[PDB]
Design a protein around this ligand. Structure first.
Ligand SMILES: CCCC[C@@H]1NC(=O)[C@H](CCCCN)NC(=O)Cc2cccc(c2)CNC(=O)CNC(=O)[C@H](NC(=N)N)CCCCNC1=O
Lengths: 39, 154
C-alpha cells in the first residue's frame, strides 16, 4: 500500500474564530494499547 | 519536509483515501499511531522512516524525535485546525473539557469530524501545536470527545 503525505496548509491561529462545543468532564481509562474508554 | 499541516493518504490501484493528518515541524513529521500503524511514509519521491513512537500515547514521529513541546495551559480556549477529507483546513475554537484519569487530567475537545481528520493539530493562541486530535471516546448521545494528545520533546 502506497501511504503518502500531501501538504494541506499553514499552521496559524485564526483571529475572531467560530467558537463551538461544550467542555465535558469525563472519567476515562487509558489502556496499554492507547484505547480511551469511559469508566 | 517543509513546515506545515499535511494529509496522510493511501492508494492502491484505484483512488486515494485520506486516513489522517499530521504536522511537519523542524524536519520531523508528527501524526497519530492509528493513522499509519507505525509504517513508513512517502513524501514526493522521498521516504520518511519512523523514528519515535508510543502506542499508549497513540503517537509516532518520522525522521527524528518528537518536536512538539507546547502544552495546553489548562485554562484557555484552543483551536482545532481540522483538515477533514476533501475539505480545506479550517479553524474551530473551543474551551476544552477534561478527561480525568487515575494518572491525571488531560484536556479534551468536544469536536466531531470524520475519522480521516485524525492527526489534525490543536493550537494555542500563539499558533503552537499543543497536541493532535483524534484519540477519544464516544459519549452517550453518540457525539465525540478527543483528548488533546501531546508527546514529550526529550
Ligand atoms: C483505534 C482507532 C481510533 C480512531 C479514532 N476513533 C476514536 O477515537 C473513537 C474511540 C471510541 C472509544 C474506544 N474505546 N472511535 C469511534 O468514534 C468509532 C465509532 C463509534 C461509533 C460510530 C462511529 C464510529 C461512526 N462514525 C464515523 O464513522 C465517523 N466519526 C467517528 O469515527 C468519530 N465520531 C463519532 N461521533 N463516533 C470521530 C473520529 C475522529 C478521529 N478519530 C478516530 O477515528
Amino acid at each position: 500500500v502506497d501511504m503518502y503525505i500531501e501538504r494541506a496548509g499553514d499552521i496559524t491561529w485564526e483571529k475572531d474564530a467560530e467558537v463551538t462545543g461544550n467542555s465535558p468532564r469525563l472519567d476515562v481509562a487509558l489502556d496499554e494499547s492507547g484505547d480511551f474508554s469511559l469508566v | 519536509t517543509t513546515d506545515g499541516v499535511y494529509r496522510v493518504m493511501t492508494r492502491r490501484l484505484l483512488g486515494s483515501t485520506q486516513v489522517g493528518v499530521g504536522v511537519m515541524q523542524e524536519g520531523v513529521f508528527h501524526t497519530m499511531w492509528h493513522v499509519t500503524k507505525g509504517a513508513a511514509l512517502r513524501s514526493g519521491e522521498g521516504r520518511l522512516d519512523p523514528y519515535w513512537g508510543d502506542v499508549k500515547q497513540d503517537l509516532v514521529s518520522y525522521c527524528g524525535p518528537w518536536k512538539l513541546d507546547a502544552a495546553w495551559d489548562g485554562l484557555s480556549e484552543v483551536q482545532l485546525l481540522a483538515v477533514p477529507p476533501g475539505e480545506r483546513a479550517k479553524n474551530i475554537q473551543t474551551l476544552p473539557g477534561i478527561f480525568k484519569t487515575k494518572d491525571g487530567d488531560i484536556g479534551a475537545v468536544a469536536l466531531d469530524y470524520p475519522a480521516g481528520t485524525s492527526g489534525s493539530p490543536i493550537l494555542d493562541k500563539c499558533g503552537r501545536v499543543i497536541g493532535l486530535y483524534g484519540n477519544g471516546v464516544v459519549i452517550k448521545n453518540g457525539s465525540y470527545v478527543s483528548a488533546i494528545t501531546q508527546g514529550k520533546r526529550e
